[PDB]
């Protein structure tokens, strides 16, 4: 799959992955270094 | 003619990028002129112009018959209040130009402002009206330790400062700092914008140095380094001054307009001063008196100041407009929108139009215009750029464009890459 | 942004286009309505691009394997034929362009690689890539070569890295599994290993594309070359006596082109498509349409039952239809321009050295999963 990353002035500040099987494509946030417990 | 952005258009614009740059570097502060005494701002906000963009312009007029005043470039600047008051700028020509004689009176009640650059043409062709960063209206600093009464008057690390110098019975008033040719000068002309670093008690000398955060205080091991070319001084300690003698046991906040000294760290009383046009180190003689009080020179006294800058950007994609391109668009972040069917790219800012269109590159995206601080767009088809893939050496930087429905293009310092999922 | 009342076509510019303008204006006369019909560059690339904002051609003509795409981000109009109507044409050609249980577009004609030989420089082509190697040797001797062809493009390349072992994604489980690739296993690896190698040995040139390997078919100068049926009109009118027959065998083993379905597809944003369909069902897919268009430059195997049985003893159009018997119909998944991308790159960089041929396989199969 392809990740779009985007930054403001050579720095930084968003990463956009594609949305998961259900249903359509579609983008949505993602911090790859980040665990969040459930 | 009002004619919309064609792909040719754009792939054209893509291949060379000669946007029309406007700089205004200008101080956060401004101290007030009570009663007659005008108290010009220092340092004097100056006006820069980039890009080949105007001498080519400025040949295309001459070319279409315009003659020499018609084809010459007019800039004006003002306060905002009274709006009717503007000064001439001597702008034409240059790559800079420096407002010297700009002053807030004691009957402006404003809190606050922002200086306004109108640019035209000598024929009448509207170029805009360009605005500094908001400009905090203050009073003379105090012999009071800074408390946090305002995050605004306090310097953080990390962030620009003016050091400059007023000289008394001389005919070159102020001196400040500036960088030229690798060279740190005490300029009558010039000043740079300074990054001013906190570094550790324990931090050698070095040029890749440490990252640390927090408000500078006096007594701090400071890093001064140029914006522009990135030169700097050795280690700083920060020191207040009072009279013309440095105060070592002061490790209060560092304050906007605070006369202060720079002591060379690990030197035997070596500070940083002038001498003419020169930066050198001179000696502080200690106090026979008071002991944590040395005695320094005129020219190692320095006054600090918050500096900012306004940077506008505009491209003639489809030749020059009957409007002005005056409000510039600006994106200050992004984030996904969630809230609706389909998650959209939303651009946060200023000056936004249901005039405006986000392109990702030379590919035009579905955009929706929902106030004047917030535009939504669809993230269009960018699977093409997998071709690149194992093939470019560095993944492209993608510019974000936002395009007017006259084919103003207003680059966003935005860009985008498309890559592997790791 | 699309004009209502006209009909804008695109299609690639290898394809009989003058002869579809034919048909476009045979139309016009009939309905009033102008045809215009266009062949941009990257054209395929073009059409997610811009008819995402309501733009690009009422039509768009491709093989059917970019279509799923298209399909899957809203771009296609749903193609709903009459019974009678779908009757007339192949079912696995309709099968080409099916998508999610549903027709996105109208299947026209399939098409396969075959390999083109000089009569005259060689009256008995190799069975086998293993003799080109001694055949070149030969050639070379009277200033002549045995084989060019298009080397930038993985449609060409394809059927040599298929040969022993090499596939796209699999099919598991009612469906094609996107996460099993088969760029880089031992058969793709030994396929791509002796393309690098003919290049190594100076048998064949890296920087060989469609134009270059073209020219020197038609003007005599190779006795060998690797086209589809679109390229047979500029060999009839060059002085080259040719055969159109299987291609060569690797490892004993035939190679397996990726067969494709020249396919129609309607604009979701176009505000004609009662008149596309009209254009397309009433006047192309039909005896005389497809004639018009095949005189032009030959389509290959034609999805409607009665021109394709019209055309079927034509043996250049029988050797088409034995390689693609070899082969496979490309999946039309999302996934398949991913793929391309990758493998493309993969061919590219073994070729001109700039990666090793495991090294390129290795990264094309993480990128055409990624
Ligand atoms: O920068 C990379 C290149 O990107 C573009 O080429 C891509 C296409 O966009 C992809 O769709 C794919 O192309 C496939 C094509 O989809 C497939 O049908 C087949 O194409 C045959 C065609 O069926 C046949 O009728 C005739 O026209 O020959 C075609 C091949 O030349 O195979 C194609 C792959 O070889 O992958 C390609 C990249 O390989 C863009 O158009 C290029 O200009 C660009 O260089």
Same mark, same amino acid.
């Given at each position: 799959?392809?990740?779009?990353?985007?930054?403001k002035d050579g720095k930084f500040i968003?990463?956009?992955?594609?949305?998961?099987?259900?249903?359509?494509?579609?983008?949505?946030?993602?911090?790859?270094?980040?665990?969040?417990?459930? | 003619?009002?004619?919309?952005?064609?792909?040719?258009?754009?792939?054209?614009?893509? +291949?060379?990028?000669?946007?029309?740059?406007?700089?205004?570097?200008?101080?956060? &502060?401004?101290?007030?002129?009570?009663?007659?005494?005008?108290?010009?701002?220092?340092?004097?906000?100056?006006?820069?112009?980039?890009?080949?963009?105007?001498?080519?312009?400025?040949?295309?007029?001459?070319?279409?018959?315009?003659?020499?005043?018609?084809?010459?470039?007019?800039?004006?600047?003002?306060?905002?209040?009274?709006?009717?008051?503007?000064?001439?700028?001597?702008?034409?020509?240059?790559?800079?130009?420096?407002?010297?004689?700009?002053?807030?009176?004691?009957?402006?009640? +404003?809190?606050?402002?922002?200086?306004?650059?109108?640019?035209?043409?000598?024929?009448?062709?509207?170029?805009? &009206?360009?605005?500094?960063?908001?400009?905090? &209206?203050?009073?003379?600093?105090?012999?009071?330790?800074?408390?946090?009464?305002?995050?605004?008057?306090?310097?953080?690390?990390?962030?620009?400062?003016?050091?400059?110098?007023?000289?008394?019975?001389?005919?070159?008033?102020?001196?400040?700092?500036?960088?030229?040719?690798?060279?740190?000068?005490?300029?009558?002309?010039?000043?740079?914008?300074?990054?001013?670093?906190?570094?550790?008690?324990?931090?050698?000398?070095?040029?890749?140095?440490?990252?640390?955060?927090?408000?500078?205080?006096?007594?701090?091991?400071?890093?001064?380094?140029?914006?522009?070319?990135?030169?700097?001084?050795?280690?700083?300690?920060?020191?207040?001054?009072?009279?013309?003698?440095?105060?070592?046991?002061?490790?209060?906040?560092?304050?906007?307009?605070?006369?202060?000294?720079?002591?060379?760290?690990?030197?035997?009383?070596?500070?940083?001063?002038?001498?003419?046009?020169?930066?050198?180190?001179?000696?502080?003689?200690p106090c026979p008196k008071e002991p944590?009080?040395?005695?320094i020179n005129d020219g190692a006294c320095?006054?600090?100041?918050?500096?900012?800058?306004?940077?506008?950007?505009?491209?003639?994609?489809?030749?020059?407009?009957?409007?002005?391109?005056?409000?510039?668009?600006?994106?200050?972040?992004?984030?996904?929108?969630?809230?609706?069917?389909?998650?959209?790219?939303?651009?946060?800012?200023?000056?936004?139009?249901?005039?405006?269109?986000?392109?990702?590159?030379?590919?035009?995206?579905?955009?929706?215009?929902?106030?004047?601080?917030?535009?939504?767009?669809? /993230?269009?088809?960018?699977?093409?750029?997998?071709?690149?893939?194992?093939? /470019? +050496?560095?993944?492209?930087?993608?510019?974000?464009?936002?395009?007017?429905?006259?084919?103003?293009?207003?680059?966003?310092?935005?860009?985008?890459?498309?890559?592997?999922?790791? | 942004?699309?004009?209502?009342?006209?009909?804008?076509?695109?299609?690639?510019?290898?394809?009989?286009?003058?002869?579809?303008?034919?048909?476009?204006?045979?139309?016009?006369?009939?309905?009033?309505?102008?045809?215009?019909?266009?062949?941009?560059?990257?054209?395929?690339?073009?059409?997610?691009?811009?008819?995402?904002?309501?733009?690009?051609?009422?039509?768009?003509?491709?093989?059917?394997?970019?279509?799923?795409?298209?399909?899957?981000?809203?771009?296609?109009?749903?193609?709903?034929?009459?019974?009678?109507?779908?009757?007339?044409?192949?079912?696995?050609?309709?099968?080409?362009?099916?998508?999610?249980?549903?027709?996105?577009?109208?299947?026209?004609?399939?098409?396969?690689?075959?390999?083109?030989?000089?009569?005259?420089?060689?009256?008995?082509?190799?069975?086998?890539?293993?003799?080109?190697?001694?055949?070149?040797?030969?050639?070379?001797?009277?200033?002549?070569?045995?084989?060019?062809?298009?080397?930038?493009?993985?449609?060409?390349?394809?059927?040599?890295?298929?040969?022993?072992?090499?596939?796209?994604?699999?099919?598991?489980?009612?469906?094609?599994?996107?996460?099993?690739?088969?760029?880089?296993?031992?058969?793709?690896?030994?396929?791509?290993?002796?393309?690098?190698?003919?290049? *190594?040995? *100076?048998?064949?040139?890296?920087?060989?594309?469609?134009?270059?390997?073209?020219?020197?078919?038609?003007?005599?100068?190779?006795?060998?070359?690797?086209?589809?049926?679109?390229?047979?009109?500029?060999?009839?009118?060059?002085?080259?006596?040719?055969?159109?027959?299987?291609?060569?065998?690797?490892?004993?083993?035939?190679?397996?082109?990726?067969?494709?379905?020249?396919?129609?597809?309607?604009?979701?944003?176009?505000?004609?498509?009662?008149?596309?369909?009209?254009?397309?069902?009433?006047?192309?897919?039909?005896?005389?349409?497809?004639?018009?268009?095949?005189?032009?430059?030959?389509?290959?195997?034609?999805?409607?039952?009665?021109?394709? %049985?019209?055309?079927?003893?034509?043996?250049?159009?029988?050797?088409?239809?034995?390689?693609?018997?070899?082969?496979?119909?490309?999946?039309?998944?999302? @996934?398949?321009?991913?793929?391309?991308?990758?493998?493309?790159?993969?061919?590219?960089?073994?070729?001109?050295?700039? @990666?090793?041929?495991? %090294?390129?396989?290795?990264?094309?199969?993480?990128?055409?999963?990624?």
């Amino acid at each position: 799959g392809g990740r779009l990353q985007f930054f403001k002035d050579g720095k930084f500040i968003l990463e956009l992955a594609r949305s998961k099987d259900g249903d359509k494509s579609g983008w949505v946030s993602v911090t790859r270094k980040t665990f969040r417990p459930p | 003619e009002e004619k919309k952005l064609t792909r040719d258009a754009m792939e054209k614009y893509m +291949r060379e990028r000669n946007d029309m740059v406007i700089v205004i570097l200008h101080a956060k &502060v401004a101290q007030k002129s009570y009663g007659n005494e005008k108290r010009f701002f220092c340092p004097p906000p100056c006006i820069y112009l980039f890009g080949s963009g105007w001498t080519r312009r400025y040949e295309e007029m001459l070319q279409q018959g315009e003659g020499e005043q018609g084809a010459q470039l007019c800039a004006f600047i003002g306060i905002g209040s009274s709006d009717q008051d503007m000064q001439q700028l001597d702008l034409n020509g240059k790559q800079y130009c420096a407002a010297k004689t700009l002053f807030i009176s004691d009957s402006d009640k +404003r809190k606050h402002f922002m200086l306004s650059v109108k640019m035209f043409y000598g024929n009448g062709h509207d170029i805009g &009206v360009f605005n500094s960063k908001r400009i905090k &209206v203050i009073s003379k600093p105090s012999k009071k330790k800074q408390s946090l009464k305002n995050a605004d008057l306090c310097i953080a690390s990390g962030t620009n400062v003016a050091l400059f110098n007023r000289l008394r019975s001389q005919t070159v008033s102020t001196r400040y700092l500036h960088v030229e040719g690798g060279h740190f000068h005490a300029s009558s002309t010039q000043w740079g914008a300074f990054t001013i670093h906190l570094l550790d008690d324990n931090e050698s000398e070095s040029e890749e140095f440490q990252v640390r955060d927090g408000y500078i205080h006096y007594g701090a091991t400071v890093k001064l380094v140029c914006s522009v070319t990135g030169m700097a001084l050795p280690r700083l300690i920060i020191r207040k001054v009072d009279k013309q003698m440095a105060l070592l046991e002061a490790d209060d906040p560092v304050s906007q307009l605070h006369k202060c000294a720079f002591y060379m760290k690990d030197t035997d009383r070596m500070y940083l001063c002038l001498s003419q046009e020169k930066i050198i180190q001179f000696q502080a003689t200690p106090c026979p008196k008071e002991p944590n009080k040395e005695m320094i020179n005129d020219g190692a006294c320095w006054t600090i100041i918050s500096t900012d800058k306004a940077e506008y950007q505009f491209y003639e994609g489809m030749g020059p407009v009957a409007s002005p391109v005056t409000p510039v668009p600006i994106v200050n972040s992004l984030n996904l929108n969630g809230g609706g069917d389909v998650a959209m790219l939303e651009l946060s800012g200023d000056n936004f139009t249901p005039h405006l269109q986000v392109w990702f590159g030379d590919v035009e995206a579905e955009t929706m215009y929902r106030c004047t601080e917030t535009l939504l767009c669809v /993230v269009p088809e960018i699977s093409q750029f997998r071709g690149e893939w194992l093939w /470019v +050496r560095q993944p492209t930087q993608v510019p974000i464009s936002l395009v007017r429905n006259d084919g103003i293009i207003y680059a966003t310092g935005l860009t985008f890459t498309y890559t592997p999922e790791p | 942004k699309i004009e209502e009342g006209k009909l804008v076509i695109w299609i690639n510019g290898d394809k009989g286009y003058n002869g579809l303008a034919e048909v476009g204006k045979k139309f016009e006369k009939d309905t009033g309505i102008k045809v215009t019909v266009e062949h941009p560059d990257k054209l395929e690339e073009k059409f997610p691009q811009v008819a995402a904002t309501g733009d690009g051609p009422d039509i768009i003509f491709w093989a059917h394997d970019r279509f799923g795409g298209y399909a899957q981000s809203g771009l296609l109009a749903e193609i709903t034929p009459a019974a009678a109507f779908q009757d007339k044409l192949y079912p696995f050609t309709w099968d080409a362009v099916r998508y999610n249980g549903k027709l996105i577009a109208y299947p026209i004609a399939v098409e396969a690689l075959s390999l083109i030989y000089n009569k005259d420089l060689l009256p008995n082509p190799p069975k086998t890539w293993e003799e080109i190697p001694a055949l070149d040797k030969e050639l070379k001797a009277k200033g002549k070569s045995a084989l060019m062809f298009n080397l930038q493009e993985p449609y060409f390349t394809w059927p040599l890295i298929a040969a022993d072992g090499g596939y796209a994604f699999k099919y598991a489980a009612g469906k094609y599994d996107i996460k099993d690739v088969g760029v880089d296993n031992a058969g793709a690896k030994a396929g791509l290993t002796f393309l690098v190698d003919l290049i *190594k040995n *100076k048998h064949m040139n890296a920087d060989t594309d469609y134009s270059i390997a073209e020219a020197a078919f038609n003007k005599g100068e190779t006795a060998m070359t690797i086209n589809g049926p679109w390229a047979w009109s500029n060999i009839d009118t060059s002085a080259v006596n040719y055969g159109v027959t299987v291609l060569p065998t690797f490892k004993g083993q035939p190679s397996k082109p990726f067969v494709g379905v020249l396919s129609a597809g309607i604009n979701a944003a176009s505000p004609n498509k009662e008149l596309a369909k009209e254009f397309l069902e009433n006047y192309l897919l039909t005896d005389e349409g497809l004639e018009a268009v095949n005189k032009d430059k030959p389509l290959g195997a034609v999805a409607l039952k009665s021109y394709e %049985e019209e055309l079927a003893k034509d043996p250049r159009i029988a050797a088409t239809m034995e390689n693609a018997q070899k082969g496979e119909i490309m999946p039309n998944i999302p @996934q398949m321009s991913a793929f391309w991308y990758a493998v493309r790159t993969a061919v590219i960089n073994a070729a001109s050295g700039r @990666q090793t041929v495991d %090294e390129a396989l290795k990264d094309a199969q993480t990128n055409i999963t990624k």
